[PDB]
Write a protein that binds this ligand. Structure first.
Ligand SMILES: Nc1ncnc2c1ncn2[C@@H]1O[C@H](C[C@@H](N)CC[C@H](N)C(=O)O)[C@@H](O)[C@H]1O
Ligand SMILES: Nc1ncnc2c1ncn2[C@@H]1O[C@H](C[C@@H](N)CC[C@H](N)C(=O)O)[C@@H](O)[C@H]1O
Lengths: 344, 344
């Protein structure tokens, strides 16, 4: 028993760490230039937060962030990695002649032993919609190793949500589902499953990007301060919203993105996944409503987005929304574990 | 516990049956017109093999093949399905007014109880390169329920292999692996992992289609007779080959496809996934050599393809090949579980 094993189905964990054991998957993240370059910038431009310091890298993967901490002058970097990627990180530490400074520790951060407390924790634990993968909890957990007044890079995370209109995306779900609305598919009446098919498609958050013109109101922001938050704070995430509609139209759902800030002694550096910013491997995420809501400019769209952590390293998403002026309401349940990857 | 649980890692099984629980995935198979239409043809044109007979459908999914057995006049059809798709099949059986003839039985065919021995077993248990998923073993296992001189649909399966030349494919995989040849990726020397990266990328069989002109020799055929084979026969599959090269050039690997035959009392019907035939959702599969072999027209390319079943419902593929005239040899290990889907 650890904190990780207690919150995670073994079958989910096996698949998860298998995925990250692939060099190709580490490469995918590494080649996201906005991601990798911003981390390097955050670390190097805040060199005083690393110079002669003790560092923990939570989920080091290839080791890339630990190498940046080394470039910034860290004395010692504990690089923790639970997948078989830990073996490859070790190879790189030796080939880059950094054995005196980067120590790879294979295992889950919730299960390993560190020899000493650290000045600063670095990690890239963000998933889709920020919270997917539940690795933010591992990052917060790692604070048991943090010296008092130690730092976290990133320091804070902001989730943004905004209502969108996208009639073509909405309609696409019914078109797919209507495969089932055939009374004689090779002589078989499939129609009884059409509703189940619709339900299945609407349960998948949509991962892709979009034009900012689809957004119908200024975003609402939910902030997690990684210096102050406890792991338990991420088990149930309640995001109330009150959108003041800037455009009239049919609201088909809520769009999500996230930013993180590295609040260093020299400067604050932001990594944004917003649709106004260059694209990242996180794209953006949209959660559809099964019934859209009509709203006019100046109306208020109010409700709650409730994210409930599950044992498959993800979240059950519940979105309830109403147009206050008409009482028209929509209620939606989504499975963040299994998004629809729409981008092309 | 059961023959299934003994040969299968739980984490693999969970993911596998989750996949097939999706209506979208059942739809993907159902909409393969060559697949679904050829099954219907095989069954209906051999109506005497079904008329007033008892049938087992191994892995019924939506129920579609059981409906075809019903159309052909079967008295009773036991439709076994281990995913939650079984519940959707039940719905269709009721909505098609076939409750008197199709009996859905939720569970693994190696764990359920059938009330009764059967005249004929129908299944679509073919994966990529025929053997992926190890469902052919469940199909063979189901023969414990088959009456003496009962039939199997499909009855036999042929795997074809042929050498191919495709420099562009080769270079694409090598280009991706060569990400890890860089001496200064954001200042970090990745080159110590280049060999491991080549191994990983070359370990992935390539799923897509191709022009038949890339083939350098007539195919070699390996046949599995489903009437006679035992599940244990699929644990280690040894396919010797001796290709008489028709064209001179660089051999970049072996291409694989498969056919199955439904040997009925009225006629034999073939389902082919060959690159000479209309495309199916199985496409074709190519196993690259890390280093290509030069051969001249008239040379012999000889060796063995060895498929060793693993607990992740797939196979470790070993391909050893040599050009007899020069002694040039290539030895390759591939992981059929995790193919590169290139057609997308
Ligand atoms: N609980 C955990 N303990 C240790 N490592 C973990 C844990 N959870 C996730 N990881 C690893 O964290 C890494 C997360 C990656 N997104 C980041 C890799 C790398 N730090 C990079 O920035 O490129 C993966 O390699 C996971 O295997
Ligand atoms: N051991 C097993 N016991 C019961 N069902 C299985 C087993 N292995 C695989 N399956 C199911 O077999 C089905 C395989 C599909 N290729 C076929 C579905 C359907 N018969 C069709 O032809 O459309 C999936 O629905 C799996 O969930």
């Amino acid at each position: 028993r650890s904190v990780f094993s207690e919150r995670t189905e073994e079958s989910s964990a096996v698949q998860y760490f298998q995925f990250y054991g692939y060099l190709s998957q580490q490469q995918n993240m590494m080649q996201d230039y906005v991601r990798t370059g911003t981390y390097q910038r955050a670390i190097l431009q805040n060199h005083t937060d690393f110079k002669d310091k003790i560092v923990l890298d939570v989920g080091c993967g290839s080791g890339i962030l630990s190498f940046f901490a080394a470039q910034a002058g860290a004395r010692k970097i504990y690089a923790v990695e639970a997948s078989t990627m830990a073996q490859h990180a070790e190879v790189l530490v030796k080939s880059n002649n950094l054995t005196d400074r980067i120590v790879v520790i294979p295992g889950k951060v919730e299960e390993v032993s560190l020899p000493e407390q650290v000045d600063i924790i670095i990690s890239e634990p963000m998933g889709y919609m920020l919270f997917n993968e539940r690795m933010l909890e591992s990052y917060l957990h790692a604070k048991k190793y943090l010296k008092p007044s130690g730092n976290m890079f990133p320091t804070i995370g902001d989730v943004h949500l905004a209502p969108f209109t996208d009639e073509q995306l909405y309609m696409e779900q019914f078109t797919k589902a209507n495969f089932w609305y055939q009374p004689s598919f090779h002589g078989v009446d499939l129609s009884a499953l059409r509703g189940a098919a619709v339900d299945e498609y609407f349960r998948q958050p949509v991962v892709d990007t979009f034009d900012i013109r689809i957004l119908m109101a200024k975003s609402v922001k939910y902030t997690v301060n990684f210096l102050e938050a406890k792991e338990g704070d991420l088990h149930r995430i309640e995001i109330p919203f009150k959108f003041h509609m800037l455009h009239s139209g049919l609201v088909h759902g809520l769009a999500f993105w996230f930013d993180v800030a590295f609040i260093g002694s020299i400067m604050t550096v932001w990594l944004s996944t917003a649709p106004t910013e260059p694209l990242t491997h996180w794209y953006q995420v949209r959660c559809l409503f099964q019934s859209p809501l009509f709203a006019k400019a100046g109306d208020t769209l109010s409700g709650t987005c409730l994210l409930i952590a599950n044992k498959r390293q993800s979240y059950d998403i519940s979105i309830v929304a109403q147009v206050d002026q008409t009482g028209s309401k929509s209620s939606n349940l989504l499975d963040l574990k299994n998004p629809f990857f729409r981008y092309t």
